[PDB]
Amino acid sequence: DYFTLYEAHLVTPDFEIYGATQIGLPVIRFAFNQRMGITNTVNGMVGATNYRLTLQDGGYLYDGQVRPFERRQASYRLRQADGTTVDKPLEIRSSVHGPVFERADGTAVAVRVAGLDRPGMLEQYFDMITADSFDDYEAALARMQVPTFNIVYADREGTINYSFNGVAPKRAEGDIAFWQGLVPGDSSRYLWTETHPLDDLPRVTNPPGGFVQNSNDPPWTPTWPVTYTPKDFPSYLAPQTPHSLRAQQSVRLMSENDDLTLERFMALQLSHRAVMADRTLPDLIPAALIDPDPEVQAAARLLAAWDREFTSDSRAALLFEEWARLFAGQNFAGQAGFATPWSLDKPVSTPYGVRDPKAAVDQLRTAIANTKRKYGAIDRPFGDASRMILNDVNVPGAAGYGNLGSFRVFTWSDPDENGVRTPVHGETWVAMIEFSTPVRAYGLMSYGNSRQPGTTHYSDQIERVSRADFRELLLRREQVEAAVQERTPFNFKP
Amino acid sequence: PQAPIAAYKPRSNEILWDGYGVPHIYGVDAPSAFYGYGWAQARSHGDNILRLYGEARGKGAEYWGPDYEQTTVWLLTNGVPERAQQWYAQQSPDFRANLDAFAAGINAYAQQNPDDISPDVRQVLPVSGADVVAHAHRLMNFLYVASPGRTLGEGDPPDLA
């Protein structure tokens, strides 16, 4: 509900913004205009701490002493089945850290959220997306009112920037995993009070490689060559974990290509490679062909002949996914199966290989069974099982799971009884902009621009998505006047 | 150096909607554009917007019963509704007027098109500038940054479609 995006275009005498944003927000988070544009990705900025309290004598232990809770008696109303409401009491207990919650297992936890004193989130975004210059953009960003997100920026003057943005507490010790778990709630040692300014955070501007990127990876290869390393920052800002195969593809697609056109940029975004197959099939196939089971041999020959792309017509891709579920977990992020582990020294070519081929063939054996049960056969076309269905529009799917290496993402659901599955998460608003004069931009919204019952604008873009047939985005008045189908005059009197 | 194309200067307030239901909102000043934007959003996503604003008031349990209760406890315990009132008062006067206009656009869409608002979210109306601030606050700080799941020791993401 909360995550649904909406596309819009605003024009006044003093500003212009085009793009997508979460419904209910009065500013456009994914915005561009004739001068500039930004986008966002989740960085998981650790902006809160959960403290384990030690309860003692009706208070909590803190620096050797029992300390009483701040307590207030509040209440809220709860609607009953018969349409009335009843008054329910609610105690709000609080420690120095913040408000206290009790987990089902009895753990008393106090949550401390940073940046509760930052009222200007909406205005900061607003000033960012209507900035007259990069310096103005940066001064807005530097206010620290937007508590999270990677944020990427480009403009018609030629500047690009990546910022690992958010409001991060200053701490004197502890790495990210420590501050992500339950931190001890019995000592002022772990009670932070200040937060980092913008120039303490990983950022990159106009780097020698001529691009920036982020695909939810930790911020240590935002560009290539890199301009910093993890030791340049406090160890609690971001993980030092293996980069996903999608994120590896992100770096490669940008770094290895040059003399880019908007057209080629768009084509690169559609990348749907089974990178994990590149890392595993060289060891897996010969090991599997040794197996006496003729079904495993046949499975191995089907995988070997596959071009390793998640296309609609792929007969091997479903089977490969089912193998990967076992070899790398249900999220495809597990590392224990590989022979050569991930390394930041080879960040787009590790991990690699199959550590234990014999065990992996056993995983293939099980995956064959799983595949036939889910989909009816080991060689069902990928796009016959994977469909994009909104109202009465039913179109073939392509691309897939990010952790298998697909850049363009469709997190396919578990299949229904007929083996049909649809995206639960993935491509929504997709736009590509060139900051020429005038700007040129194309985009699509997977699930349309409206969700009101009976609208003709819920399912009217998904067929175009199935063919990567992008809409030209219309910012110039004359383009808008040529395309208009409805005019709503309004007037606002405060 | 080459300047950008001449900016368009709106002379009247209007939404030009294209064939995919994208609103092109022209305002003679900022508050007008924000009003148009709220009207549009109400038209395209009104019901779920009203539900979300209702929740961010801490009134989910009151409006819609037990399925909304744990979110209500999370938000009231974290003081979200009152903090939003403070952030709203703490806005710069000019941006506050933009937020007020946005909310007024929602209210106006609903008032002019009451058939399009689902019965059980009607009780949310009217919405205010502070509701707009509150929803943003709950989204950023109390879904993205601090989720109920990570504090309460639960797990799987939201589940209401």
Partner: peptide, 28 residues
Amino acid sequence: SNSWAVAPGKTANGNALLLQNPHLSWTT
């Protein structure tokens, strides 16, 4: 989600490029 920005020197026409590409729930 994915995000790309490309500097002028890496393009043919000499203008920066931007990809907006948030991955979010469809909630069908």
